[PDB]
Scaffold this active site. Structure first.
Site, PDB file in Angstrom:
ATOM      1  N   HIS A  46       0.935  -1.071   0.086  1.00 16.63           N
ATOM      2  CA  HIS A  46       0.250   0.119   0.478  1.00 16.63           C
ATOM      3  C   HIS A  46       0.848   1.442   0.293  1.00 16.63           C
ATOM      4  CE1 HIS A  46      -0.304   0.440   4.743  1.00 16.63           C
ATOM      5  NE2 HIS A  46       0.336   1.615   4.317  1.00 16.63           N
ATOM      6  N   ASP A  97      -1.098  -7.211   1.549  1.00 20.00           N
ATOM      7  CA  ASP A  97      -0.314  -6.260   2.122  1.00 20.00           C
ATOM      8  C   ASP A  97       1.587  -6.691   2.498  1.00 20.00           C
ATOM      9  OD1 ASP A  97      -0.235  -3.234   1.934  1.00 20.00           O
ATOM     10  OD2 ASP A  97      -0.742  -2.994   3.781  1.00 20.00           O
ATOM     11  N   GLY A 196       2.838   7.145   8.362  1.00 22.45           N
ATOM     12  CA  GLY A 196       3.797   7.263   8.809  1.00 22.45           C
ATOM     13  C   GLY A 196       4.186   5.164   9.474  1.00 22.45           C
ATOM     14  N   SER A 198       3.538   2.499   7.921  1.00 21.95           N
ATOM     15  CA  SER A 198       3.370   1.388   8.064  1.00 21.95           C
ATOM     16  C   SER A 198       5.013   0.796   6.880  1.00 21.95           C
ATOM     17  CB  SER A 198       2.544   2.071   6.412  1.00 21.95           C
ATOM     18  OG  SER A 198       0.829   2.343   7.232  1.00 21.95           O
TER      19      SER A 198
HETATM   20  C1  SH1 Z   1       0.631   3.138   7.687  1.00 19.73           C
HETATM   21  O1  SH1 Z   1       0.286   3.531   6.126  1.00 19.73           O
HETATM   22  C2  SH1 Z   1      -0.672   3.291   8.711  1.00 19.73           C
HETATM   23  C3  SH1 Z   1      -0.499   2.673   9.876  1.00 19.73           C
HETATM   24  C4  SH1 Z   1      -2.010   2.314  10.266  1.00 19.73           C
HETATM   25  C5  SH1 Z   1      -1.701   2.209  11.975  1.00 19.73           C
HETATM   26  N1  SH1 Z   1      -3.275   2.159  12.377  1.00 19.73           N
HETATM   27  C6  SH1 Z   1      -3.108   0.736  13.648  1.00 19.73           C
HETATM   28  N2  SH1 Z   1      -4.019   1.623  14.437  1.00 19.73           N
HETATM   29  N3  SH1 Z   1      -1.745   1.180  14.294  1.00 19.73           N
HETATM   30  N4  SH1 Z   1      -2.173   2.630   8.041  1.00 19.73           N
HETATM   31  C7  SH1 Z   1      -2.478   3.485   6.810  1.00 19.73           C
HETATM   32  O2  SH1 Z   1      -3.417   4.166   7.206  1.00 19.73           O
HETATM   33  C8  SH1 Z   1      -3.882   1.991   6.458  1.00 19.73           C
HETATM   34  C9  SH1 Z   1      -3.613   2.504   4.656  1.00 19.73           C
HETATM   35  N5  SH1 Z   1      -5.050   2.489   6.463  1.00 19.73           N
HETATM   36  C10 SH1 Z   1      -5.773   2.400   7.716  1.00 19.73           C
HETATM   37  O3  SH1 Z   1      -4.590   1.710   8.758  1.00 19.73           O
HETATM   38  C11 SH1 Z   1      -7.475   2.873   7.775  1.00 19.73           C
HETATM   39  C12 SH1 Z   1      -7.897   1.849   6.912  1.00 19.73           C
HETATM   40  O4  SH1 Z   1      -7.913   0.613   7.980  1.00 19.73           O
HETATM   41  N6  SH1 Z   1      -7.689   3.492   9.165  1.00 19.73           N
HETATM   42  S1  SH1 Z   1      -7.974   4.902   9.515  1.00 19.73           S
HETATM   43  O5  SH1 Z   1      -9.542   4.358  10.894  1.00 19.73           O
HETATM   44  O6  SH1 Z   1      -9.566   5.415   8.542  1.00 19.73           O
HETATM   45  C13 SH1 Z   1      -7.100   5.595  10.035  1.00 19.73           C
HETATM   46  C14 SH1 Z   1      -7.390   7.290   9.813  1.00 19.73           C
HETATM   47  C15 SH1 Z   1      -7.367   8.051  11.005  1.00 19.73           C
HETATM   48  C16 SH1 Z   1      -8.936   8.094  11.524  1.00 19.73           C
HETATM   49  C17 SH1 Z   1      -9.028   8.309  12.756  1.00 19.73           C
HETATM   50  C18 SH1 Z   1      -7.342   8.692  13.470  1.00 19.73           C
HETATM   51  C19 SH1 Z   1      -6.626   8.603  13.099  1.00 19.73           C
HETATM   52  C20 SH1 Z   1      -6.706   7.930  12.097  1.00 19.73           C
END
Ligand code: SH1
Length: 247
Positions: A46, A97, A196, A198
């Site tokens: 991703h 992934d 950040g 990932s």
């Molecule tokens: C790295 O790209 C990242 C790591 C997430 C690690 N999260 C943990 N809880 N350990 N991965 C992403 O951003 C991936 C591509 N996408 C997501 O995780 C999305 C979809 O599952 N999750 S989210 O809940 O839409 C992330 C956005 C968000 C929302 C609210 C507060 C913080 C972050």
């Protein structure tokens, strides 16, 4: 990394920092990775799926800071960018992934081992640590969900492995999490990986040996109660890894 503490590359020698070049000269951070062998770095698909051009990436090994140099660091180009063909993204879940980057320096060489540059071991076929086991994660990611900038110093934290049964509960992730994924969280919900982070390593001590058990993939928010981090289960990908690293 939400919570946890600052660390140095000396304590996480297998950590790889991956950046992308832009038109003009600006270079931004994309994702973390792990050196599984002198010429190979493993990360998450991703991270590159939207810009699959190997020439735009820069891989750093032996790096402790986001925007400055570290004595002993080494810069690498991406010789080969391998993405998983079955990668797909649902509402929350990111399937398959995982990705491999073949690295080479300007002189055409791979990495030279040192105090700040070492490889991490891979797990055995379907041999994972017992659930309830403590493991560490490392990354240059957000410290709080409200932040838009990344910390300058590398961070690390410790989280506990959660079972599939528990992670599959209604208030958790339900059927969204599969057997090819690993859940990990802090029993108090204070620490966790975040945006950040990932592609980075989920490292567990398996029989006295540090092993690359997971790859930071996804999660609902960051450090939210009943919402663990989800990691790509590296053990279920050994065949795919071996076939793409030969020649
Ligand atoms: C790295 O790209 C990242 C790591 C997430 C690690 N999260 C943990 N809880 N350990 N991965 C992403 O951003 C991936 C591509 N996408 C997501 O995780 C999305 C979809 O599952 N999750 S989210 O809940 O839409 C992330 C956005 C968000 C929302 C609210 C507060 C913080 C972050």
């Amino acid at each position: 990394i939400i919570g946890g503490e600052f660390t140095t590359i000396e304590n996480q020698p297998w950590f790889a920092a991956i950046y992308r070049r832009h038109r003009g000269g600006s270079v931004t951070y994309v994702c973390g990775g792990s050196l599984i062998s002198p010429c190979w770095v493993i990360s998450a698909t991703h991270c590159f799926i939207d810009y699959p051009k190997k020439e735009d990436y820069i891989v750093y090994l032996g790096r402790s800071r986001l925007n400055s140099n570290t004595q002993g660091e080494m810069k690498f180009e991406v010789e080969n960018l391998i993405l998983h063909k079955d990668y797909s993204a649902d509402t929350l879940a990111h399937h398959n992934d995982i990705a491999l980057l073949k690295i080479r320096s300007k002189e055409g060489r791979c990495a030279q081992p040192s105090r700040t540059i070492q490889t991490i071991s891979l797990p055995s076929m379907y041999n994972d640590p017992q659930f309830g086991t403590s493991c560490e994660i490392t990354g240059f990611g957000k410290e709080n969900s409200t932040d838009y900038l990344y910390p300058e110093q590398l961070k690390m934290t410790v989280v506990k492995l959660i079972s599939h049964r528990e992670c599959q509960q209604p208030h958790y992730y339900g059927s969204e999490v599969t057997t090819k994924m690993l859940c990990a969280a802090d029993p108090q919900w204070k620490t966790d990986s975040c945006q950040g982070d990932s592609g980075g390593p989920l490292v567990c001590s398996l029989q006295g040996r540090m092993t690359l058990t997971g790859i930071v993939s996804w999660g609902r928010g960051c450090a939210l109660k009943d919402k663990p981090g989800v990691y790509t289960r590296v053990s279920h990908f050994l065949p795919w890894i071996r076939s793409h690293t030969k020649e």
